[PDB]
């Protein structure tokens, strides 16, 4: 009843979630080098004051509902096998700052999944190869990177994101359309070969190539 931390890592044989039916005062719970596939649903019924929750290197199939527990600050669920995210995963969850989901099997994120959370500062959904990405309620994050999402081709709306500063999109065609530099730094830099406004660039050179194709064929047929 006084335990604060519990950091198990490298426990590469345990395949069941530990029994915590009496520990209700821990701050950070970490099971990193594990093999855990079933987080019990009855989690927020206890541990009512944790401010960290790390379960990275352990194959997790799905997630429970974090209904309540509005003291949770950071989460990290990497390297898992989370195929889907339901809408009730983040009900409430005030003062949640960082949320990573990198390197999983996410392919569909429900639209109403980020509308209830508090002021998230960072949110990384990377290398998941999803198809669509809802932006409802993400109007407060300062860094959001989606790199290994080559299946995602949709262009993100810049109206929702207001105070965003760092953005890493799969293709360099969302960052340019985002119209950054409010100044926004984007890792997949569009450079010069990949434009957003005009393919030919300035209006001077366009007037030049307009003459080339106009004459390269009118005389050629003769």
């Amino acid at each position: 009843s006084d335990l604060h931390s519990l950091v198990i890592r490298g426990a590469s044989m345990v395949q069941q979630f530990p029994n915590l039916t009496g520990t209700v005062h821990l701050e950070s719970l970490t099971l990193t080098g594990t093999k855990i596939s079933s987080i019990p649903n009855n989690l927020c019924q206890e541990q009512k004051m944790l401010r960290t929750l790390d379960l990275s290197y352990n194959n997790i199939r799905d997630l429970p509902s974090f209904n309540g527990c509005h003291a949770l600050e950071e989460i990290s669920l990497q390297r898992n096998q989370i195929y889907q995210i339901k809408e009730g995963t983040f009900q409430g969850l005030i003062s949640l700052r960082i949320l990573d989901l990198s390197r999983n099997l996410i392919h569909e994120i429900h639209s109403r999944a980020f509308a209830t959370l508090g002021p998230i500062t960072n949110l990384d959904v990377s290398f998941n190869e999803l198809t669509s990405f809802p932006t409802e309620g993400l109007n407060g994050l300062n860094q959001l990177k989606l790199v290994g999402n080559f299946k995602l081709k949709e262009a993100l709306a810049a109206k929702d994101f207001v105070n965003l500063r760092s953005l890493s999109v799969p293709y360099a065609y969302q960052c340019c359309a985002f119209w950054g530099c409010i100044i926004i730094h984007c890792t997949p830099s569009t450079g010069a070969f990949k434009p957003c406004e005009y393919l030919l660039g300035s209006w001077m050179i366009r007037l030049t190539v307009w003459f080339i194709f106009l004459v390269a064929l009118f005389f050629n047929l003769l």
Binding site: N142, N163, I183, G201, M204, I205, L207, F211
Partner: protein, 179 residues
């Protein structure tokens, strides 16, 4: 009229919120950083004998009032900024959203540039800045100007006029053959 990139930081994890403003031609335009210290327009007068001093380095926020409210202002708008830099400030941020004439008051006084940047934030963007200076207990302000690229628009004139020069000569060659 060069844009100013000013953002505020909140130590606790540091949430960052940014906003845009326009530099003014009264102080040498360059980047600066410091703590936000709100200063009342009437507190930056000069006839005062002795006043309490702040630690060196602080971005002062001054929300200007209506010009008709003050019939005999103690100092000019440029005088306010010059006093603050002497006081120990490093970058004065104004708020001309209520006194639009201050922009002319600053840009006219180009005879004696100031050593430190001076910024004016107008419109509804200053409302967000005031909502931060009103609520948060400690803030950290940085102002920066980093315009990259322009690098093809500059060479566009050289590439475009060259083709016209090439074509006008070909025009005369066709003209002179038939005549």
């Amino acid at each position: 009229k060069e844009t100013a990139f000013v953002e505020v930081v909140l130590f606790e994890t540091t949430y960052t919120t940014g906003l845009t403003g326009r530099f003014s031609r009264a102080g040498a335009t360059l980047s600066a950083e410091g703590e936000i210290v709100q200063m009342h327009p009437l507190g930056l007068c000069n006839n005062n004998d002795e006043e309490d001093l702040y630690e060196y380095g602080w971005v002062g926020v001054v929300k200007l009032e209506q010009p008709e409210l003050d019939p005999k202002p103690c100092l000019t708008v440029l005088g306010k900024a010059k006093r603050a830099v002497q006081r120990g400030a490093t970058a004065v941020i104004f708020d001309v959203s209520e006194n639009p004439e201050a922009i002319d008051q600053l840009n006219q006084g180009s005879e004696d540039p100031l050593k430190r940047p001076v910024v004016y934030v107008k419109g509804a963007d200053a409302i967000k800045l005031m909502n931060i200076v009103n609520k948060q207990k400690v803030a950290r302000a940085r102002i920066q100007h980093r315009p990259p690229r322009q690098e093809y628009f500059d060479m566009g004139i050289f590439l475009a006029f060259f083709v016209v020069v090439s074509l006008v000569c070909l025009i005369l060659l066709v003209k002179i053959k038939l005549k």
